[PDB]
C-alpha cells in the first residue's frame, strides 16, 4: 500500500541524482525513506508536513507500521544486509527521552551525544560507529564536518547478495563512453528471464537473490540511456515483475563493487524537504529547550556484486547500465543505481 508512493520517491530521488553527471549512482530508497520517516516523529506541524509530503505522501500515518513491517520483513532474515541510522547530537542540549525510545523501538536506530566543538574528534566517533555497524565495509563515511553542526543523521547500507543461480569468470573491457576501461566480467550461457523492451529501448534482465530479493538490470541501447531513465515508471516495472518467461542468451554481467555517498540536505532540499534543515526548523520533539535544525544528513550505500541448436544473443553489460533491487515480498525498491565505471 506504501510501495507505489515509495517507488515514485525512488525515481524522483534517482532522477534528481542524474542531474547532480557521469558518476556511479547507488542508494537505498527504503533506507532514506525510513530514516526521515523516523525523523518525522520529533517534528511539529509545518516541519512534520514537509517530510511526509516530501516522501510522496490522504496519508494514514500508519506508514510507520508499514515501514516497521518492511523493516521487520528485512530484519535479521535471509540475506546479508547491513542497514542502520545514527543520530548524533551535541552534548548538553537537553534532549527529549520520549524521542530516543521510539527511534530504537520502531526503527532500531541509535542516538549518541558527541562534541561537535571538536570537529576532528566528532568525525572520528561518527565514522567509527558506522565502521562498527558495517564491520569494515564502509570506512570514513564522513569527509567534511561543518563547524556549526548541532544535529547529524547518518544512514548507511551495505549489500552482499546470494544468487539463486550460482553463476568461471574472466576479464573484459568496459566502454564508459563512445573511452574503454577494463574490468572483470562474469559470464554464463543458459536460460535467463531476459527480454528486450521497445518502450524503454533497453535490455531487461531479472535475476532473483537467495534472500527473497530480485535484481533488475536495464541495459540501454546504443545511445538511449537518457531515454531509459526518463521513461522508467512504477507501472512499467510491475509489468516486468509480473512477467514469467525464459529465453536462451549468453549473459555477460560485470563483477563490481560500487559505493555511493550523498549529502541528503542538498538532494532532498530540491525535493521539497527543507524545513528540518533551515534556520526556522521546528524539532520540538527532539529538544524543547532551544531551536534545533538538522545540520547534516548523509547517506552511504555500498554494493558488492560477485558469483555466489541456435546462436543466442550476447547480452554484454559492458557499458553503462541501470539496475534495481526489489524486495520480492513487499515489491519495494531496496536499491537503485547506475554503473558508469566499475573501476572507481
Amino acid at each position: 500500500k506504501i510501495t507505489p508512493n515509495l517507488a515514485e520517491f525512488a525515481f524522483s530521488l534517482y532522477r534528481q541524482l542524474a542531474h547532480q553527471n557521469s558518476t556511479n549512482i547507488f542508494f537505498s530508497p527504503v533506507s532514506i525513506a525510513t530514516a526521515f520517516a523516523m525523523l518525522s516523529l520529533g517534528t511539529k506541524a509545518d516541519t512534520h508536513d514537509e517530510i511526509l509530503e516530501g516522501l510522496n505522501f490522504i496519508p494514514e500515518a500508519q506508514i510507520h507500521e508499514g515501514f516497521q513491517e518492511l523493516l521487520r520483513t528485512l530484519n535479521q532474515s535471509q540475506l546479508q544486509l547491513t542497514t542502520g541510522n545514527g543520530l548524533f547530537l551535541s552534548e548538553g542540549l537537553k534532549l527529549v527521552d520520549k524521542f530516543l525510545e521510539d527511534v530504537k523501538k520502531l526503527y532500531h536506530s541509535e542516538a549518541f551525544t558527541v562534541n561537535f566543538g571538536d570537529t576532528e574528534e566528532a568525525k572520528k566517533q561518527i565514522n567509527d560507529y558506522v565502521e562498527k555497524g558495517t564491520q569494515g565495509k564502509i570506512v570514513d563515511l564522513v569527509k567534511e564536518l561543518d563547524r556549526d553542526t548541532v544535529f547529524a543523521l547518518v544512514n548507511y547500507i551495505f549489500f552482499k547478495g546470494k544468487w539463486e543461480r550460482p553463476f568461471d569468470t574472466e576479464e573484459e573491457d568496459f566502454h564508459v563512453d563512445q573511452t574503454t576501461v577494463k574490468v572483470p566480467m562474469m559470464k554464463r550461457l543458459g536460460m535467463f528471464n531476459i527480454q528486450h523492451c521497445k518502450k524503454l529501448s533497453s535490455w531487461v534482465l531479472l535475476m532473483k537473490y537467495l534472500g527473497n530479493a530480485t535484481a533488475i538490470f536495464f541495459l540501454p541501447d546504443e545511445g538511449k540511456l537518457q531515454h531509459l531513465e526518463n521513461e522508467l515508471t512504477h507501472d512499467i516495472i510491475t509489468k516486468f515483475l509480473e512477467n514469467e518467461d525464459r529465453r536462451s542468451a549468453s549473459l555477460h554481467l560485470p563483477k563490481l563493487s560500487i559505493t555511493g555517498t550523498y549529502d541528503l540536505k542538498s538532494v532532498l532540499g530540491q525535493l521539497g524537504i527543507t524545513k528540518v534543515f533551515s534556520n526556522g526548523a521546528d524539532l520540538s520533539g527532539v529538544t524543547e529547550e532551544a531551536p534545533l535544525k538538522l545540520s547534516k544528513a548523509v547517506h552511504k550505500a555500498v554494493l558488492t556484486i560477485d558469483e555466489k541448436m541456435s546462436i543466442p544473443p550476447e547480452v554484454k553489460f559492458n557499458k553503462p547500465f541501470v539496475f534495481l533491487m526489489i524486495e520480492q515480498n513487499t515489491k519495494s525498491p531496496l536499491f537503485m543505481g547506475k554503473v558508469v565505471n566499475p573501476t572507481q
Binding site: H196, D221, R247, I311, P313, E314
Partner: peptide
C-alpha cells in the same frame, strides 16, 4: 559482421 538487431522483445542475427 553479424549484428543482433532488436525488433520486439527479441531480435535476429
Amino acid at each position: 559482421r553479424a549484428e543482433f538487431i532488436t525488433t520486439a522483445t527479441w531480435g535476429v542475427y
